[PDB]
């Protein structure tokens, strides 16, 4: 109940602070701006990973599970950053990354070292198939999903880069080892997990080809190996072994499950997670269809009001374009990222911000593919080469799409690399930290920044804003959200004007008093309540008796 009530914040380390002049970011650079997370109002911080990584995958490839990545510090720096949060009364997640290890892990390179060894099964193997892979699949990150090992003459499954080969979760010994890993985090006293790629732990056994109606070199796979009978047996045995033994939060990152096949993962009554994030509103690629969006949201809000289940709110995070340019209007920067706060952060969950969310950073054009780091973009800016798209149209999915546009650094002021780094940045600043940063947003009072820090207060200071019931209103209207939350006699009312015009609304009505709680433009003297003449992207959220 503690995380019903918390307000989360998602640190990427390599792109946060940079605290000693290498350009990447590090556990001391997160530990210098501890002061700024607890003034935001933040309860709980989620920091992606942090263990020792080739990098590959930027800490999603993990070489050792109990040593921390050499760019961001020692295992002293990390204690120190846990006894530093906590003394500041917030808490720390950790990302739990056990679909995949490195293939410098130690287990791996035991597992490739010959066809038979103690190890060999710790993975996925596999004999080829007509002098070809195994299978037809294809990685998430474009190419085959296998990889060919010369010495042993097999290929090893890899659904995300090459160098992150599969646990093989059908492997006692490989769940055993997992799960003391997972207690050795939980007993130095971390508040929990989120869980990566956890929705990919099961593959169809005997990993048979996919249909291939367009005759693709490789067939896109999640019907193999994303959310697929049986999981479920895993995810329990996990959770019996590690989850349930302490009092953390547990959010599990679990693509392919829809709002009406959420119960075994986030149910109050045996679920395996607290709470998930899912995709299903994060992959709507012109106006947005706004009334597609209150389908999903409300589909969710309502379905695991049913099941007693607790959403995960967000709009960002390290996979995705920002916000902004996402669902909002960067010809409305400040405004529409104000109101897309006040949307998804007042609907019944646990709401996440990803940093640089709360100061309306937004997408950033690079033209050299040198530029970029995501390995999923530069794998598809070789093979849609190679198949014959020009640079432009690859740049533009890239520029429109690459979730390296969330991945630039975290903008604190004017200075050289927005004050994120002395040196040279891994990744480019984005030039408009000139406008954007947080220097210059802590003292505007009506800065984005200052907009979320009232987003926070006012759902902890009222009760309604956590546990209110969620009801959609105006759904055929295509620029207004509209929505209430109620808890005995109070009502939140949370208007969002998701388009870049101004338009009417009739304020949707028997209450005793009405209080404006925030408002993101100024009030108009002669308006009346009824008739609501709302700015582009205005907002308004108003508490009834
Ligand atoms: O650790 C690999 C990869 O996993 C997570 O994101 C995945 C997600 O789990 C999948 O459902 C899939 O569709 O693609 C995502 C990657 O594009 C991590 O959040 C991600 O950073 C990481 O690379
Ligand atoms: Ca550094
Ligand atoms: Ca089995
Ligand atoms: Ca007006």
Redesign the pocket.
């Given at each position: 109940k503690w995380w019903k009530e918390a307000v989360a914040y998602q640190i990427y380390p390599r792109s946060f602070m940079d605290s000693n002049g290498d350009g990447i970011g590090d556990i001391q650079g997160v530990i210098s701006k501890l002061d700024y997370l607890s003034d935001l109002g933040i309860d709980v911080i989620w920091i992606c990973p942090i263990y020792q990584s080739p990098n590959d995958?930027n800490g999603?490839d993990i070489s050792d599970y109990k040593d921390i990545m050499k760019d961001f510090g020692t295992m002293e720096d990390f204690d120190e950053l846990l006894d530093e949060v906590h003394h500041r009364g917030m808490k720390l997640i950790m990302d739990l990354?056990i679909?995949?290890t490195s293939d410098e892990h130690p287990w791996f390179l035991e597992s490739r070292s010959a066809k038979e060894n103690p190890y060999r099964d710790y993975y996925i193997w596999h004999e080829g198939k007509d002098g070809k892979e195994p299978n037809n699949w294809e990685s998430?990150f474009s190419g085959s999903a296998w990889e060919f090992d010369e010495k042993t003459k097999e290929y090893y499954m890899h659904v995300?880069s090459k160098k992150?080969p599969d646990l093989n979760w059908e492997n006692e010994k490989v769940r055993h080892e997992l799960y003391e890993m997972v207690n050795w985090w939980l007993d130095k006293g971390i508040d929990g997990f989120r869980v990566?790629?956890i929705?990919?732990i099961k593959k169809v056994a005997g990993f048979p080809d996919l249909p291939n109606p367009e005759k693709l070199d490789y067939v896109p796979s999640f019907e193999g190996h994303?959310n697929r009978p049986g999981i479920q047996e895993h995810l329990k045995e996990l959770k019996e072994k590690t989850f349930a033994k302490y009092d953390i939060m547990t959010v599990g990152?679990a693509?392919?499950v829809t709002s009406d096949s959420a119960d075994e993962w986030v149910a109050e009554d045996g679920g395996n997670f607290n709470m998930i994030f899912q995709?299903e509103h994060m992959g709507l690629w012109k106006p947005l269809d706004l009334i597609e969006l209150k389908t999903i949201l409300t589909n969710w809000q309502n379905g695991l009001e049913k099941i007693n289940g607790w959403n995960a709110l967000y709009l960002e995070?390290?996979?995705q374009i920002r916000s902004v340019n996402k669902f909002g209007s960067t010809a409305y920067r400040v405004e529409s990222a104000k109101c897309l706060a006040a949307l998804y952060f007042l609907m019944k969950g646990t709401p996440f911000i990803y940093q640089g969310q709360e100061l309306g950073m937004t997408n950033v054009k690079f033209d050299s593919i040198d530029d970029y780091d995501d390995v999923?973009m530069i794998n598809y800016y070789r093979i849609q080469r190679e198949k014959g798209d020009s640079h432009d149209e690859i740049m533009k999915v890239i520029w429109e799409t690459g979730?390296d546009n969330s991945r630039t650094p975290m903008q604190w002021n004017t200075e050289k690399n927005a004050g994120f780094s002395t040196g040279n940045p891994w990744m480019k600043v984005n030039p408009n930290y000139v406008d954007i940063n947080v220097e210059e947003q802590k003292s505007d009072k009506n800065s984005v920044l200052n907009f979320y820090k009232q987003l926070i207060k006012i759902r902890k200071q009222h009760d309604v804003l956590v546990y209110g019931t969620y009801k959609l209103l105006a759904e055929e209207d295509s620029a207004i959200y509209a929505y209430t939350r109620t808890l005995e006699g109070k009502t939140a009312v949370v208007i969002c004007n998701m388009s870049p015009n101004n338009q009417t609304f009739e304020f949707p009505s028997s209450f005793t008093n009405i209080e404006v709680l925030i408002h993101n433009y100024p009030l108009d003297k002669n308006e009346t309540l009824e008739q609501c003449t709302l700015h582009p992207y205005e907002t308004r959220v108003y508490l009834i008796s």
């Open positions: 995958d999603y990354v679909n995949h998430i995300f992150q990566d790629a929705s990919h994303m990152q693509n392919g995709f995070n390290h996979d999923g979730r």
